[PDB]
């Protein structure tokens, strides 16, 4: 049968097993609380949805946000423990709360600003890239990583969620579009160079300072990339600007382990084609000592067929439950 539940004001209105409630964040990630789940003895993290079906588009992002959540089932990834609603019924289901680990801390948090030694990094990165091998094996592209969106435990064990602007690939910055799954290499890149190094890799300060960092670390586009470029104003644009080369990434990395800086090479490279894919990435001889190719697993097809579709309020609603119904928890 049906969980009891209780209401405390933060009107929150939890099954019991969820104690201890206690906001975290505070607005940064929407209204989200820590919590002790008793039937699991694990802390967790409870969102409740704002508004979810005030409008189509709640609507929509509220099934997005559901379904997403809950293809994703993967240690390196955020996904759910739980997910629930006060509602007995469909006509009185305006709420969706949804569970996760409360890891506690990103990853800002934990390199500090610092350098991390060559042993953590690998540990990190591999975490990473195991995770996006999976996100993108769905067909899913993140487009935003970034150390605010890595969430990681005492025992550095990370997953990936989900200032600003400094890990997005240029393509990205641009709108582009057509965009490739490796604007998240691009973004893994940035962050393991500045986890080696203790500082931000492209701190741009503001979005033409960020291309122009970025331009003197990895040159100018060369022939192969500008006959890809179809808009003729990006192409004649490009061409006017002094030639750059790029620089060699052994003399900027100092220090660095020499497969760190091979590895940052194949991720950082202008041409989004010619960037080393998370699959690829792991199988590098960086992480020979975490490496193992039969404990990297990819995800069932996920269906974004949705996105397309313009349906009615209370369809992405019925929906919506359909998919809080059918939920099964982890084991
Ligand atoms: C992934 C979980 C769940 N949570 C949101 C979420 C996502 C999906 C879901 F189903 C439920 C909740 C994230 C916002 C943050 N989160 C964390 O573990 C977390 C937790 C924290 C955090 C705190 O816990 C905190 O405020 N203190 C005082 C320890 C401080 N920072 C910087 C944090 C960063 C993260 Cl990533
Ligand atoms: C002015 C700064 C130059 C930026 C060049 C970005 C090149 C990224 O690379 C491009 O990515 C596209 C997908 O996003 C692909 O379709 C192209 O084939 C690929 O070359």
Same mark, same amino acid.
């Given at each position: ?186 973004? =893994? +890149?940035?962050?393991? /160079? &500045? *986890? @080696? ?10 979005? !033409?300072?960020? #291309? ?5 670390? =990895? +040159?100018?586009?060369? /022939? &192969? *990339? @500008? ?10 644009? !490009?061409?006017? #600007? ?90």
């Amino acid at each position: 049968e049906r969980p009891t539940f209780y209401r405390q004001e933060l009107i929150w209105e939890v099954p019991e097993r969820y104690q201890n409630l206690s906001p975290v964040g505070s607005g940064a990630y929407g209204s989200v609380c820590a919590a002790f789940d008793t039937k699991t003895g694990l802390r967790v993290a409870v969102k409740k949805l704002s508004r979810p079906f005030q409008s189509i588009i709640h609507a929509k992002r509220t099934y997005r946000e559901l379904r997403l959540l809950k293809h994703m089932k993967h240690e390196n990834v955020i996904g759910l423990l739980d997910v629930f609603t006060p509602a007995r019924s469909l006509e009185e289901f305006n709420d969706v709360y949804l569970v996760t680990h409360l890891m506690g801390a990103d990853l800002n948090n934990i390199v500090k600003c610092q350098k991390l030694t060559d042993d953590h990094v690998q540990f990190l990165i591999y975490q990473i890239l195991r995770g996006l091998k999976y996100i993108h094996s769905a067909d899913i592209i993140h487009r935003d990583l970034k150390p605010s969106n890595l969430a990681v435990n005492e025992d550095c064990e990370l997953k990936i969620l989900d200032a600003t602007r400094w890990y997005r690939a240029p393509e990205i910055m641009l709108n582009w579009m057509h965009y490739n799954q490796t604007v998240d290499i691009w973004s =893994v +890149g940035c962050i393991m /160079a &500045e *986890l @080696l190094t203790g500082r931000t890799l492209f701190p741009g300060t503001d979005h !033409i300072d960020q #291309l122009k960092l970025i331009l003197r670390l =990895v +040159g100018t586009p060369g /022939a &192969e *990339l @500008l006959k890809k470029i179809s808009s003729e104003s990006a192409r004649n644009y !490009i061409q006017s #600007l002094t030639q750059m080369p790029k620089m060699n990434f052994a003399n900027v990395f100092i220090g660095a382990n020499p497969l760190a800086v091979d590895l940052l090479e194949k991720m950082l490279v202008l041409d989004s084609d010619k960037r080393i894919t998370a699959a690829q990435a792991l199988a590098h001889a960086y992480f020979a000592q975490y490496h193992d190719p039969d404990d990297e697993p990819v995800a069932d097809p996920y269906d974004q067929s949705f996105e397309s579709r313009d349906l009615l309020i209370d369809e992405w609603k019925s929906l919506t439950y359909d998919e809080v119904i059918s939920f099964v928890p982890p084991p």
